[PDB]
Structure formats: structure tokens, C-alpha cells
Scaffold this active site. Structure first.
Site: not given
Length: 330
Positions: A35, A199
């Protein structure tokens, strides 16, 4: 040193991925959920409340010659999905894919929430976010990666998740055979303890690319791609009959649909998520309504590049003094 371990989807939907991990002496192999959105290595154990164990493999510290109680240490964690676990702590030897760390904090669960009990395939979590998020008190502990780092040939690990197929976690090296083209690296903020990046924009299907900054985290422990409501609405508007269902808890679409791809930007590079990656199948067994793999991050307080996005790429988690992320097509 290096390590290399195969990671395997737990089910036909790629809801999560499990990676075998050796703990203790002699080894006890547990299948853990790696994770990158959390920082605790915790396991089902001989200490877990018996009614909360249903098919998981347990760690038994009393059977490990290298286990030592970390006296006074406790832990307690809550995840984004409302699941939780807590317990006490041992140190022990932990190996992943041939890479060994001695003195790793192994957080032994006394209690787990129902979602963990109900998932027999996951024996615990191995956190790979920054150690500042580790919940052990009163002495915070380091992740497996942070403890391994100094010994690694390069201070990196890579995630190569498969679509309906096994993939790989590598530690200490970048497998130049595992991706196509070049890796594009992008800046990381560690301010919230995550692999947080920005992004450069997105496109829906064959549509034009929208240049826009989307801050979010690279999180292998989250199944879906959670983005701003504007972006998600623009995606699902291209699927006839798709709608947001408050009853189901997100966007659903007719199972008869063909889904468009979704592109996200990494600097000037582009990663394309095929439409099939965005199909999470019927909402209930036999239903003709299917659950979408792109969902709104509204109310979560962060955008999350979960497995739907990461499995479309070869992803480098660069833990050098200035961390960065890299993405390549594959």
C-alpha cells in the site's frame, strides 16, 4: 541488494493485489497488500480476536526465534474506506522477494474491522508511503522500504501491476525490460506523507487533451481512480446511460456499454488507461448495471491515482533524498 516479488490480484476484478512476504525465523509467509498510501506493516496474528479471523494466514510471533516484543508500542489505523485495525508491535526479520530487513516493526493486529475479516485473501498490509504516516506510538516506526533503503543498489521501488494478471514489485533496481519507451519523472510533495504529485491533464477516449493541474497521490492500496467531479463527469458523459447513483455510491453504467479510454498526463508524457480497465462489473450479482472504475474524489479531500491508473503504467517510486515518481507505458 535488491528484491523482486510477484503481486497477484485477489479476485477477477483486481480489487487488490497480494504479495508474499516472509516474516520471522523459520519464515512464516503471509500474503500482504502493498500500500503506497499508508505506512504501517500490520498482520493478522495469533493475537487477533478469534471471531475477527476468517481464513487469513496468521503471524505467530511465539514461533519466531527472531521476534521481539517492542515493549509499550501500540498502533491504530483508519483507512479512506472506513476500515481499521489496531494492536501491538514486534520487531522481526522481514523478507520480500529475496530482500531482507532485520528489526522491521511488524504490527500485530488485536482488532480488525469487518472488511478485513471478510477478505480471507489479505493477511495484512505493507505500507510504502513515507514513514511520517506510521501510526506506532510512542516511538514511530519505519516502513520496510525506509529500513531497506541504505542497503539497496538504488533507493527505489517499482510497481508493475497487471490487468487481470500478476505483476511485480521490485526493490532497489529499475527493470529496463518491464516498460516501453522512456520513464517520465515528476516531482513529489511529501508534505502529507504520500507519494503526492501533479498530473498535467487528461483526455477522454479519442478527445482532445485538457491541460490542467491535478494534484493527487499514487496509491497502490486504492482500487479505483478518484478525480475531481468535473473530470469524472466529462468521462461518464461519453457513456450512454451512465449516471451517478447515490444508492450505489458512485457512477454506474450499462453493462452493455463499451467504455472509452482515459488518458492522464505525466509532464509532457501521457498514460492511457484502456476502457476495459474502468469496468468493475455488475453492482450485484446478475445486475445489468456495472460499477465504474473512475469515481469522484469530492468529499475524500484528495485525488487518488489508485490501481486503475497505476496498472496502466510501470511506476517508479524514487526514494532518493529528493523523492520523485516516474511513469512509463508498458
Amino acid at each position: 541488494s535488491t528484491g523482486s516479488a510477484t503481486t497477484t490480484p485477489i479476485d477477477s476484478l483486481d480489487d487488490a493485489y497480494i504479495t508474499p512476504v516472509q516474516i520471522g525465523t523459520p519464515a512464516q509467509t503471509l500474503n500482504l497488500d502493498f500500500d503506497t498510501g499508508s505506512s504501517d506493516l500490520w498482520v493478522f496474528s495469533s493475537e487477533t480476536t478469534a471471531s475477527e479471523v476468517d481464513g487469513q494466514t496468521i503471524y505467530t510471533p511465539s514461533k519466531s526465534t527472531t521476534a521481539k516484543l517492542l515493549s509499550g508500542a501500540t498502533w491504530s489505523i483508519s483507512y479512506g474506506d472506513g476500515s481499521s485495525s489496531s494492536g501491538d508491535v514486534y520487531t522481526d526479520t522481514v523478507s520480500v522477494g529475496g530482500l531482507t530487513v532485520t528489526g522491521q516493526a511488524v504490527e500485530s493486529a488485536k482488532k480488525v474491522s469487518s472488511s478485513f475479516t471478510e477478505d480471507s485473501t489479505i493477511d495484512g498490509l505493507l505500507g510504502l508511503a513515507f514513514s511520517t504516516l506510521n501510526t506506532v506510538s510512542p516511538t514511530q516506526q519505519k516502513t520496510f522500504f525506509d529500513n531497506a533503503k541504505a542497503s539497496l543498489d538504488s533507493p527505489v521501488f517499482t510497481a508493475d501491476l497487471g490487468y487481470h494478471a500478476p505483476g511485480t514489485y521490485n526493490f532497489g533496481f529499475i527493470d529496463t525490460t518491464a516498460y516501453t519507451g522512456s520513464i517520465t519523472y515528476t516531482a513529489v510533495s511529501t508534505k502529507q506523507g504520500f507519494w503526492e504529485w501533479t498530473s498535467t491533464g487528461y483526455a477522454v477516449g479519442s478527445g482532445t487533451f485538457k491541460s490542467t493541474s491535478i494534484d493527487g497521490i499514487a496509491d497502490t492500496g486504492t482500487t479505483l481512480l478518484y478525480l475531481p467531479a468535473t473530470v469524472v463527469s466529462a468521462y461518464w458523459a461519453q457513456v450512454s446511460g451512465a449516471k451517478s447513483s447515490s444508492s450505489v455510491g458512485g457512477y454506474v453504467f450499462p453493462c452493455s456499454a463499451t467504455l472509452p479510454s482515459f488518458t492522464f498526463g505525466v509532464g509532457s508524457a501521457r498514460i492511457v488507461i484502456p476502457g476495459d480497465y474502468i469496468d468493475f462489473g455488475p453492482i450485484s450479482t446478475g445486475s445489468s448495471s456495472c460499477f465504474g472504475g473512475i469515481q469522484s474524489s469530492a468529499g475524500i479531500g484528495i485525488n487518488i491515482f489508485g490501481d486503475v491508473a497505476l496498472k496502466a503504467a510501470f511506476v517508479v517510486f524514487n526514494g532518493a533524498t529528493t523523492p520523485t515518481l516516474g511513469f512509463a507505458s508498458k
